[PDB]
Enzyme design. Structure first.
Site, PDB file in Angstrom:
ATOM      1  N   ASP A   7      36.947  39.015  46.066  1.00 44.45           N
ATOM      2  CA  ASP A   7      36.089  39.219  44.943  1.00 44.45           C
ATOM      3  C   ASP A   7      34.631  39.522  45.278  1.00 44.45           C
ATOM      4  O   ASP A   7      33.606  38.872  44.914  1.00 44.45           O
ATOM      5  CB  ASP A   7      36.124  37.929  44.119  1.00 44.45           C
ATOM      6  CG  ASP A   7      37.484  37.742  43.523  1.00 44.45           C
ATOM      7  OD1 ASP A   7      38.330  38.635  43.300  1.00 44.45           O
ATOM      8  OD2 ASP A   7      37.791  36.578  43.293  1.00 44.45           O
TER       9      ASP A   7
HETATM   10  N1  LIG Z   1      45.908  33.362  45.710  1.00 45.52           N
HETATM   11  C1  LIG Z   1      45.587  33.852  44.519  1.00 45.52           C
HETATM   12  N2  LIG Z   1      44.450  33.405  43.819  1.00 45.52           N
HETATM   13  C2  LIG Z   1      44.265  34.048  42.573  1.00 45.52           C
HETATM   14  C3  LIG Z   1      45.181  35.047  42.072  1.00 45.52           C
HETATM   15  N3  LIG Z   1      44.823  35.485  40.885  1.00 45.52           N
HETATM   16  C4  LIG Z   1      43.784  34.850  40.563  1.00 45.52           C
HETATM   17  N4  LIG Z   1      43.133  33.835  41.440  1.00 45.52           N
HETATM   18  C5  LIG Z   1      41.989  32.964  40.339  1.00 45.52           C
HETATM   19  O1  LIG Z   1      41.622  32.954  38.974  1.00 45.52           O
HETATM   20  C6  LIG Z   1      41.000  31.709  38.689  1.00 45.52           C
HETATM   21  C7  LIG Z   1      39.681  31.930  37.945  1.00 45.52           C
HETATM   22  O2  LIG Z   1      39.149  33.198  38.271  1.00 45.52           O
HETATM   23  P1  LIG Z   1      37.847  33.373  39.209  1.00 45.52           P
HETATM   24  O3  LIG Z   1      36.551  33.223  38.388  1.00 45.52           O
HETATM   25  O4  LIG Z   1      37.900  34.694  39.879  1.00 45.52           O
HETATM   26  O5  LIG Z   1      37.972  32.209  40.317  1.00 45.52           O
HETATM   27  P2  LIG Z   1      36.667  31.665  41.086  1.00 45.52           P
HETATM   28  O6  LIG Z   1      36.058  32.763  41.870  1.00 45.52           O
HETATM   29  O7  LIG Z   1      37.018  30.468  41.989  1.00 45.52           O
HETATM   30  O8  LIG Z   1      35.665  31.223  39.905  1.00 45.52           O
HETATM   31  P3  LIG Z   1      34.223  30.583  40.234  1.00 45.52           P
HETATM   32  O9  LIG Z   1      34.323  29.112  40.099  1.00 45.52           O
HETATM   33  O10 LIG Z   1      33.179  31.121  39.237  1.00 45.52           O
HETATM   34  O11 LIG Z   1      33.795  30.943  41.670  1.00 45.52           O
HETATM   35  C8  LIG Z   1      40.820  30.936  40.004  1.00 45.52           C
HETATM   36  O12 LIG Z   1      41.420  29.663  39.910  1.00 45.52           O
HETATM   37  C9  LIG Z   1      41.460  31.768  41.108  1.00 45.52           C
HETATM   38  O13 LIG Z   1      42.497  31.078  41.767  1.00 45.52           O
HETATM   39  C10 LIG Z   1      46.350  35.472  42.850  1.00 45.52           C
HETATM   40  O14 LIG Z   1      47.212  36.311  42.541  1.00 45.52           O
HETATM   41  N5  LIG Z   1      46.476  34.811  44.071  1.00 45.52           N
HETATM   42 MN   LIG Z   2      36.982  34.560  42.232  1.00 42.88          MN
END
Ligand SMILES: Nc1nc2c(ncn2[C@H]2O[C@H](COP(=O)(O)OP(=O)(O)OP(=O)(O)O)[C@@H](O)[C@H]2O)c(=O)[nH]1
Ligand SMILES: [Mn+2]
Ligand SMILES: [Mn+2]
Ligand SMILES: [Zn+2]
Ligand SMILES: [Zn+2]
EC number: 2.7.7.6
Lengths: 36, 145, 263, 146, 133, 114, 64, 83, 764, 188
Positions: D116
């Site tokens: 990301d």
């Molecule tokens: N391994 C894996 N992780 C994924 C997948 N799809 C989505 N993630 C996520 O989607 C959830 C929320 O989205 P994000 O905001 O991108 O996650 P994040 O970057 O940890 O969010 P922040 O706390 O703001 O840093 C998180 O719990 C991540 O695990 C996938 O296919 N595989």
């Molecule tokens: Mn993320």
């Protein structure tokens, strides 16, 4: 009470102005204090 | 249910069995019902397991409740960590849950002896804690050439 | 004249489409990269703001100034400011331009890059002049005023390379393709039902013989012919994006020979 | 004979309607009315956009130069989105936008955009992409009750 | 310095499965009721069809760098079309009272069933493989 | 900020050289040259020519991190042929074939209207 | 706020094309895409530039 | 309350923790200009020196291991096996 | 105090154990370094540069305790350092520092890294440390802490350092593997059909930093020198690494290019994907760590990344809206698959509507109805999704990600391309929140799929408004459930850590609390460290009685059942020997008891269980290392095997006490490992399957012994905290049947609650 | 102040997924299309299939058409707009219809074996960036070390570190102590 949120409290807050739609959104928010 | 069991020639086979499963628990009495196998009865209530079968059989139920939780999400944690937990929960003989001036006054009156092995107590005294790298002393080797 | 062969197909004040023929991919891509990144050029790179009652901020304006393309045919005969022995800038390392505007009219007064006045001595090197390519000869719109509003500035231009900031780049897009049929199997085509129905034919295919279905793949073939097209923004005419391009490489390589010699 | 690529709709087995919606996209509020194609997204995502939009930079009013607020962020060159919703017209999002249409590639290319993250074009930044003004105002009072 | 098995094979079958540059010949020996070839071949550098036929030689030279052609502009221990270089990983499938030796050409795979050359086929790597059409 | 000035991509610091040439320990007649304030432009070009030379056993280049404009080229050659000679021989081709091309071009461009 | 001077992506000047684009719509009645192609903005990068600009300065100029 | 050299029942192998604490006590002293016992076949970095010391078995220190009940065993650096 | 915090970014050009620290942060944090003759020149130069040029220095302190400030100090360019002063220098390349992503729920969220000073403003990390830290690069920050003394620096490099945490105790497997792009691409690189040409090959070779300079020989010489993807990766895998694995019908000719086999650090067959290079029990990172040590294992992540991401930068990979479109024909099948489930539903409807349906046993009518309609509707989703998966080609980039293991799964294909499916709120279909209906666009008493939340459409096709709103109902329930999980988990995690924090292993091998009480008489019942334990199969346990006695029984008095003399040089001479046959009877009796013992331990028959010392991989090494010909009798003797294996058991020591009690404990501690041992080194296996020589066999033993000894847990370890963090950390990735499950159960356990939600008796 | 984008700044499409810029590349080094179009941003494919953000992909297709054709693209929810229809229009304009293009590696010029989904998409710059967020407090005259950090260090066994970090600089005062009544009663 307008300057505080003192009432029920968070009832009055400073208007967001980050972007135009965040403002419109703030004017259109609702809050529910405290079974689903 | 399928049950893996040795076959007459020695290899493991499936053999299905009916099993009953209940809402609610009365272990001391259902155990006694004619026709069941009382040696293999179970419940997820490890308290009752301890009340009827004793601390050890409670310990082993409790481990198996904790293991189930961990595996049902699909993960895997080595035996010894959940073993440690469950021992800590059952070493006084029952199931014990794991979940300032005032207190020193009580220490006084009770004659509390602080073993000084914890990290905070050692901090207050300006010392290392007898953990890890602090669990031994290092000394100057006067016995060498 | 043996070696890398040329073949213009179109040309225009603004673009030059051609075919390099008998070269490696590396040299061809390298000359692409040089045209994009390292041909010297002239650009506003310091701006002093005496007055701005404009509805834009100064750095907003300044930035826009560094982007107005400025004549640069004679830019070998301007020294880099960092190489010159002056204190700061002078006529050997710098054109200085002026801009004054006042919203005299009731209606809205635009400021364009023709309103840019050079104020320094050119020694009759063709450099500095705002380039102008629109029918009305206004060039670029820099700003807009309302009746009462004022803007007065000076700028210094300086010779520079797009590595350093893209404002100094003479080139705009550079079309670049090879092997339009896919004969080299350098790329593997994604498709749902049929690769050929689904991908459009390049214009560059006419120029080059389709392959014949029997034809077992050619393992020995190499990429020897390149369909280019260089587009100029105008601070340097085109042919000159290429030739100073070829020339810039050739000097990079020579600074390497020169520095073996000095070992 | 329906369009294989349309979605499945389950027909009027109804002769008793008393009313009809004006338009189904009007169940959304302000924020979610700026997402294109929300009906093609997993639902929590439309929820996280509805928060992030509130953090984007745009032009919050035309009068900013005259106000003095604690903080403000105005982007140099707002563009209106190539993909808009009919709700936007009322939210004026085309007039006071909060974004730019960026040319995007979806690719692995060098590994510097894993987990990301993104590679952005420095040349394009040189020419103004995503640049913005930030303003801070500081205040101070005078004497008081001494 | 040698060569070490050499024979002529009939092609039963050509499977590309899932790939485009590479296929698996199922081949027989014209000769022995017993000796077979299951083998992976780059079909783009060296095509191959049902029933075609194949002169196949494992050999073992003509471990130091690799240096380009040049030595090769006279020096070819090859008069063939098609030469691979692999590594035997063997399992001496020593099955029935016939052998199978295994070989991997950076993962294009071979197998020989047969018997007469048990005192022949290197325990070992250094193994080239050679085809004319 | 923390951003190194952009001039740093094309212009040598105090005490830096265009080339540093170092003997490679891994194999014989091998060298590694590190070119400062350069990048793929040159590095892919020199490299590719070094391979049209049949006394060239090995050649390869890399920019180890994208934040610094510096590349490292490794040439191995046949016994008796200095690698630094293979790089004059190769820089010399380049400059020749481009020579050539700026001429074939300057030409094609007068044969031209608009 | 104003037409940007170049395409962010390809560098083509585009800031000398705004008055013309708007003349080509209102004065000679072309549709937005025919108009952009007339000013020679043929890659989608440059087209996005003019087509999605918003001239906010025209609002800023109404203040005194 | 001390446990004679024979009869010692704890591991004859050095532990990660002892190792860490040794190397680090000795690099502290090397770092304050204390005499070194080994050949600096170049090294300038105190931890690194210390480790060459440990490897040449020239670190004259003793590890006092307490057992839970108060008693202890003394093991010399020389003698502890380093794996 | 001596620490910094910023935004993190990935870097494919950093080593696993590095962290990039911006220059400005490196000029703000400092380490006090003592002047000595080994550093007084570098310190002098650093003083001269001062506070604002990095490598520099901010203070000098002399004998006195006087603090000289380099930024003010009128003598800042004139300091003549003395031996024994201190200089506080900026941090610099290779200083150890500790790095941490909060919340730090397990110890690999705080590891020591080697600094690397870098320009712009983020802390930068290798991709493969991300997963321990549970971090990624959309805004996350992390904290960096600089140790202040020599002892403190040594602790952090000799126990917290990243390369020492590859293999963790938590689950006795690696906690770091290859991920994301490098994993999408190492599979692509490693397909059959991938070949590379010489120009590209030499640049991939030079990209591995300690390539010996040898260009490998190409797999194709003939029309063209073309090397395979496999061979080139193989240049990064070091020598003396062997690994094998069979997947569903893998063979030693893997028609599919399945499985994996790698011999002397070269890949033979199989595509490299998440099971080999992921963070997997028994893959390559676990093998290299143990066979070659932590440092080399940590370089290997960077060498694989360098090679593979080079390759991938020039091969390219992408995904697009097209990768979610399935065939016209597949769509019609999906739509019929769905049509048939709705007809199933319609009959089970009509059926309950005419009162002809039966419930069965305490389950209401309506609950039986629901249970059935939901099974239909799920089973539809799933078939429709299998349909789409199948139909997508190998070049389908969604499918390529799934096959590599780098991201996405079946459900995602399915919901994107075939059908999103039944939505649910509290385990049930969307309920009737208006009266007798889920929305006013439906008429009353409607239990059909549409009406209660089946979303028939995929995301590509899009949702209708009704489905859209029910999918948001559903969604919402996950977002709330998720905050409650996060909060619940966090408190549990803190309470288990507080309860276990003081338990430590002691130099008697006992595990005790701060009172000295005994919790366990030996840690983990076996005295091992969980990082040194691997899943191995215990062979005696399984199998038919006939098969067990072919494999293990040696009868030297029988011509059918002796050791063929081609196995063994002594073979002729031992036929009919009576006193060897006494030993061998004794070894078999012990194998027999072993099997019975283990079948009482493991009632089920499960043969694969974590033990220390991976014997199969020691044997395979011995077989490579001694170049062992499967075609020559061995010169091992019966007694060499038999008594050699008995003697080895006496030296696998966990407890060392001279008394009987300690002896028994020792023998009980090492029983299960000793069954695995006797089953693996029994006579007929050693000669007939392994073919060991004497020399190999002697090396097999002395190694089993060293490795066993090195698995023993170390006194001093704080196994308490460890236990707690190993149980709580994975209780936090429960972001997610009719028994109370997952986190609320787990609260119910640790709370010891009298009043449980679903109490149940299972009665056989 | 003007803020020019940098490594560390955040950005997002309107489909609920953000990123920070991990590096910038000048245009020469970017991959390019035979028309010489180059991306302003490059996002990773792995951020797609699990989040099931199909609308991102459909916005990019519809946005490409819209640019090419000079019409605003209708992305409202619940209409009859389809990918198929979008893909037709984009074919009529000469590109492959699922929005793939051949692109070429910048460093070498060579074609990329795979083709690339490429198009405009609307991206937002978010507030709250690497310069607001970086601090670095090491004294002269989160970001802590709390209960959980301590516990990690205990697990690793790092006692010396735990003592250094949690000390006072409140100096080590010295004191005599009777060995019978442990009190600081001793006259020295
Ligand atoms: N391994 C894996 N992780 C994924 C997948 N799809 C989505 N993630 C996520 O989607 C959830 C929320 O989205 P994000 O905001 O991108 O996650 P994040 O970057 O940890 O969010 P922040 O706390 O703001 O840093 C998180 O719990 C991540 O695990 C996938 O296919 N595989
Ligand atoms: Mn993320
Ligand atoms: Mn994150
Ligand atoms: Zn000058
Ligand atoms: Zn453009």
């Amino acid at each position: 009470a307008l300057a505080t949120g003192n009432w029920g409290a968070g009832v009055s807050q400073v208007l967001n102005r980050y972007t135009y739609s965040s403002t419109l959104s703030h004017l259109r928010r609702t809050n529910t204090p405290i079974a689903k | 249910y399928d049950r893996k069991v040795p076959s007459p020639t020695g290899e493991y086979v499936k053999e299905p069995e009916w099993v009953l499963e209940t809402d609610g628990v009365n272990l001391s009495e259902v155990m006694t019902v004619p026709g069941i196998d009382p040696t293999r009865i179970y419940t997820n209530s490890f308290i009752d397991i301890m009340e009827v079968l004793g601390i050890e059989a409670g310990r082993a139920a409790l481990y198996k409740e904790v293991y189930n939780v961990i595996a049902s999400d699909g993960s895997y944690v080595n035996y010894r960590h959940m073993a440690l937990l469950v021992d800590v929960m059952t070493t006084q003989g029952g199931l014990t849950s794991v979940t300032t001036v005032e207190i020193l006054f009580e220490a006084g009156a009770s004659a509390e002896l602080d073993d000084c092995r914890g990290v905070s107590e050692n901090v207050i005294l300006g010392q290392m804690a007898p953990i890890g790298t602090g669990a031994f002393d290092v000394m100057i080797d006067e016995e060498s050439l | 004249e043996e070696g890398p062969q040329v073949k213009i197909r179109e040309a225009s004040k603004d673009n030059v489409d051609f075919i390099l023929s008998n070269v490696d991919l590396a040299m061809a891509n390298s000359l692409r990269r040089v045209m994009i990144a390292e041909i010297p050029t002239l650009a506003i790179d310091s701006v002093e703001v005496e007055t701005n009652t404009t509805v834009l901020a100064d750095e907003f304006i300044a930035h826009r100034l560094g982007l107005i393309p400025l004549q640069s045919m004679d830019i070998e005969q301007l020294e880099y400011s960092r190489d010159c022995f002056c204190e700061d800038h002078c006529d050997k390392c710098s054109v200085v331009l002026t801009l004054q505007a006042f919203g005299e009219s009731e209606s809205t007064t635009n400021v364009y890059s023709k309103d840019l006045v050079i104020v320094s001595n050119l020694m009759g090197r063709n450099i500095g002049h705002p380039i102008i390519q629109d029918k009305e000869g206004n060039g670029v719109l820099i700003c807009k005023l309302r009746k009462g509003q004022e803007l007065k500035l000076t700028c210094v231009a300086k010779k520079g390379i797009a590595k350093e900031h893209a404002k100094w780049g003479p080139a705009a897009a550079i079309e670049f393709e090879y092997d339009p049929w896919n004969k080299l199997k350098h790329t593997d085509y994604w498709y749902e039902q049929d690769s050929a129905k689904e991908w459009p034919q390049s214009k560059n295919c006419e120029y080059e013989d389709p392959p014949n279905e029997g034809d077992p793949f050619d393992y020995k073939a190499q990429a020897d012919t390149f369909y280019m097209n260089v587009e100029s923004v105008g601070s340097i005419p085109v042919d000159q994006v290429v030739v100073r391009g070829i020339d810039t490489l050739q000097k990079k390589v020579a600074s390497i020979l020169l520095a073996l010699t000095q070992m | 004979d329906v369009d294989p690529a349309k979605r499945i709709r389950v027909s009027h087995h109804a002769t008793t309607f008393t009313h009809c919606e004006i338009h189904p996209s009007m169940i959304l509020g302000v924020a979610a009315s700026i997402i294109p194609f929300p009906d093609h997204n997993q639902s929590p995502r439309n929820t996280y956009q509805s928060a992030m939009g509130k953090q984007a930079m745009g032009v919050f009013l035309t009068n900013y130069n005259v106000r003095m607020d604690t903080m403000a962020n105005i982007l140099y060159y707002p563009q209106k989105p190539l993909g808009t919703t009919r709700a936007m017209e009322y939210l004026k999002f085309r007039e006071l936008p909060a974004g730019q249409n960026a040319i995007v590639a979806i690719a692995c290319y060098s590994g510097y955009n894993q987990e990301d993250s993104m590679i952005m074009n420095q040349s394009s930044i040189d020419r103004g992409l995503f640049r913005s003004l930030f303003f801070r105002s500081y205040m101070d009072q005078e004497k008081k009750y001494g | 310095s040698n060569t070490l098995f050499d024979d002529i094979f009939q092609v039963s079958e050509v499977d590309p499965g899932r790939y485009n540059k590479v296929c698996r010949i199922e081949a027989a020996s014209t000769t022995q009721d017993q000796c077979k070839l299951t083998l992976d071949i780059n079909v783009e550098l060296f095509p191959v069809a049902a029933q075609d036929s194949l002169t196949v030689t494992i050999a073992s030279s003509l471990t130091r760098s690799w240096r380009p052609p040049q030595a090769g502009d006279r020096s070819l221990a090859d008069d063939y079309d098609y030469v691979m270089y692999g590594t035997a990983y063997k399992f001496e499938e020593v099955s029935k009272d016939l052998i199978a030796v295994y070989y991997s050409f950076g993962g294009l795979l071979m197998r020989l069933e047969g018997n007469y050359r048990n005192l022949n086929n290197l325990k070992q790597e250094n193994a080239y493989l050679l085809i004319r059409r | 900020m923390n951003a190194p000035d952009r001039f740093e991509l094309f212009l040598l610091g105090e005490g830096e050289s265009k080339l540093k040439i170092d003997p490679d320990t891994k194999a014989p007649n091998a060298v590694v040259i590190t070119f400062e304030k350069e990048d793929h432009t040159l590095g892919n070009l020199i490299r590719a020519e070094l391979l049209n030379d049949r006394k060239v056993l090995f050649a390869a280049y890399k920019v180890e991190h994208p934040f610094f404009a510096r590349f490292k080229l490794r040439i191995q050659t046949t016994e008796g042929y200095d690698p630094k000679d293979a790089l004059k021989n190769a820089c010399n081709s380049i400059i020749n074939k481009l020579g050539a091309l700026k001429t074939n071009f300057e030409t094609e461009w007068n044969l031209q209207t608009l | 706020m104003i037409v940007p001077v170049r395409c962010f992506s390809c560098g083509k000047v585009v800031g000398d094309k705004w008055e013309s684009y708007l003349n080509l719509l209102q004065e000679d009645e072309l549709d937005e895409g025919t108009a952009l192609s007339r000013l020679g903005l043929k890659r989608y990068c440059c087209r996005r530039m003019i087509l999605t600009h918003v001239d906010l300065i025209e609002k800023f100029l109404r203040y005194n | 309350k001390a446990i004679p050299k024979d009869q010692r029942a704890t591991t004859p192998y050095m532990t990660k923790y002892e190792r860490a604490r040794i190397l680090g006590t000795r690099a502290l002293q090397i770092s304050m200009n204390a005499p070194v016992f080994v050949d600096l076949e170049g090294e300038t970095d105190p931890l690194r020196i210390a480790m060459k010391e440990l490897a040449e078995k020239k670190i004259p220190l003793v590890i006092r291991r307490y057992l839970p009940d108060g008693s202890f065993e003394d093991w010399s650096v020389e003698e502890l096996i380093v794996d | 105090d001596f620490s910094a915090r910023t935004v993190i970014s990935g870097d494919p050009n950093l080593e696993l154990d590095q962290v990039g620290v911006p220059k400005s942060i490196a000029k703000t944090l400092t380490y006090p370094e003592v002047v000595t003759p080994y550093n007084i020149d570098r310190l002098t130069q650093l003083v001269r540069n001062g506070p604002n040029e990095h490598p520099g220095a901010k203070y000098v302190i002399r004998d006195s305790g006087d603090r000289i400030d380099l930024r003010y100090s009128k003598r800042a360019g004139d300091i003549q350092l003395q031996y024994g002063w201190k200089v506080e220098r900026h941090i610099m390349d290779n200083d150890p520092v500790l790095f941490n992503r909060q919340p730090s729920l397990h110890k690999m969220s705080m590891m020591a890294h080697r600094v690397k000073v870098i320009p712009y403003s983020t802390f930068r990390l290798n991709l493969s440390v991300t997963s321990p830290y549970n971090a990624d690069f959309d805004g996350d920050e992390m904290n960096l802490h600089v140790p202040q003394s020599e002892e403190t620096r040594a602790e952090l490099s000799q126990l917290c350092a990243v390369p020492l945490q590859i293999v963790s105790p938590q689950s006795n497997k690696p906690c770091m593997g290859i991920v994301q792009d490098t994993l999408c691409g190492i599979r692509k690189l490693t397909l059959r059909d991938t070949f590379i040409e010489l120009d590209q090959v030499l640049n991939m070779l030079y990209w591995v930093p300690d390539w010996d300079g040898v260009i490998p020989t190409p797999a194709i010489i003939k029309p063209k020198p073309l090397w395979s993807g496999k061979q080139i990766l193989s240049v990064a895998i070091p020598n003396g690494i062997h690994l094998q694995r069979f997947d569903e019908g893998t063979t030693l000719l893997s028609p599919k290019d399945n499985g994996m086999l790698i011999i002397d650090g070269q890949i033979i067959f199989g595509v490299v994907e998440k099971k080999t290079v992921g963070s997997s029990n028994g893959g390559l990172i676990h093998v290299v760590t143990r066979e070659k040590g932590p440092q080399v294992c940590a370089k290997l992540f960077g060498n694989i990344q360098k090679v593979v991401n080079f390759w991938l930068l020039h091969n390219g990979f992408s995904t697009g809206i097209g990768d979610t479109i399935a065939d016209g024909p597949t769509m019609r099948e999906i739509t019929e698959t769905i049509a048939e489930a709705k007809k199933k539903v319609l009959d089970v409807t009509k059926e309950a509507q005419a009162n002809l349906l039966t419930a069965k046993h305490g389950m209401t009518l309506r609950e039986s109805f629901e249970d059935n309609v939901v099974r239909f509707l799920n089973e539809a989703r799933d078939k429709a999704g299998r349909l789409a998966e199948v139909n997508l080609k190998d070049l389908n980039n969604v499918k390529q990600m799934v096959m590599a293991g780098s991201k996405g799964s079946f459900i995602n294909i399915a919901q994107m391309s075939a059908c999103v499916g039944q939505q649910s709120v509290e385990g049930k279909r969307i309920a009737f929140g208006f009266v007798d209906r889920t929305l006013p666009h439906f008429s009353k008493d409607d239990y059909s799929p549409e009406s209660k939340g089946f979303v028939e459409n995929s995301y590509l096709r899009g949702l209708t408004p009704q489905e859209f709103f029910f999918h948001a109902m559903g969604g919402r329930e996950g977002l709330i459930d998720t905050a409650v999980k996060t909060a619940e988990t966090g408190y549990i995690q803190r309470r288990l850590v507080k309860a276990l924090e003081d338990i430590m292993v002691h130099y008697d091998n006992t595990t005790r609390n701060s009172l000295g009480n005994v919790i366990q008489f030996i840690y983990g019942e076996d005295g091992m460290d969980a990082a040194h334990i691997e899943k191995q199969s215990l062979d005696t346990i399984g199998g038919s009685d006939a098969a067990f006695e072919k494999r293990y029984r040696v009868d030297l008095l029988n011509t059918d059942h002796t050791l063929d003399p081609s196995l063994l040089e002594s073979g002729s001479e031992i036929l009919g020997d009576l006193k060897l046959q006494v030993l061998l009877d004794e070894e078999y009796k012990q194998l027999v008891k072993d099997r019975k013992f283990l079948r009482e331990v493991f009632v089920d028959g499960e043969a694969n269980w974590p033990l220390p010392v991976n014997i199969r991989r020691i044997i395979q090494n011995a077989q490579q290392t001694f170049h062992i010909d499967h075609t020559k009798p061995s010169d091992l003797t019966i007694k060499d095997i038999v008594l050699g294996v008995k003697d080895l058991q006496e030296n696998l020591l966990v407890l060392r006490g001279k008394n009987e009690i300690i002896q028994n404990a020792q023998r009980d501690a090492v029983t299960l490992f000793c069954c695995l041992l006797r089953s693996r080194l029994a006579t007929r296996r050693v000669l007939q399957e392994y073919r060991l020589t004497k020399q190999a066999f002697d090396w097999v033993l002395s190694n089993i012994e060293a490795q066993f000894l090195r698995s023993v847990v170390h006194p001093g370890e704080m196994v308490g905290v460890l236990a707690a963090q190993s149980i709580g950390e994975p209780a936090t990735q429960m972001t997610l049947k009719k028994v109370t499950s997952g986190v609320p159960r787990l609260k119910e356990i640790l709370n010891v609650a009298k009043n449980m939600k679903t109490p149940s008796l299972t009665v056989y | 102040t003007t803020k020019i984008p940098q490594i560390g700044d955040k950005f997002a499409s309107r489909h609920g997924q953000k990123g920070t810029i991990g590096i910038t590349y000048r245009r020469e080094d970017m991959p390019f299309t035979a028309e010489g179009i180059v991306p302003d941003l490059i996002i990773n494919p792995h951020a797609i299939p699990s989040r099931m953000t199909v609308a991102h992909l459909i916005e990019c297709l519809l946005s490409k058409v819209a640019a090419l054709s000079g019409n605003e693209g209708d992305a409202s929810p619940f209409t009859d707009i389809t990918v198929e229809g979008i893909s037709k229009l984009l074919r009529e304009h000469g590109y492959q219809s699922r929005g793939f293009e051949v692109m070429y590696n910048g460093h070498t010029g060579k074609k990329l074996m795979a083709q690339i989904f490429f198009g405009p998409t609307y991206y937002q710059r978010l507030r709250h960036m690497v310069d607001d967020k970086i601090h670095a407090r090491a004294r002269g005259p989160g970001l802590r070390f709390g209960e959980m950090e301590r516990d990690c260090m205990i697990a690793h066994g790092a006692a010396s570190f735990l003592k250094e970090r949690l000390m006072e600089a409140s100096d080590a005062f010295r004191v005599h102590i009777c060995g019978i009544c442990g009190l600081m009663t001793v006259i020295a």
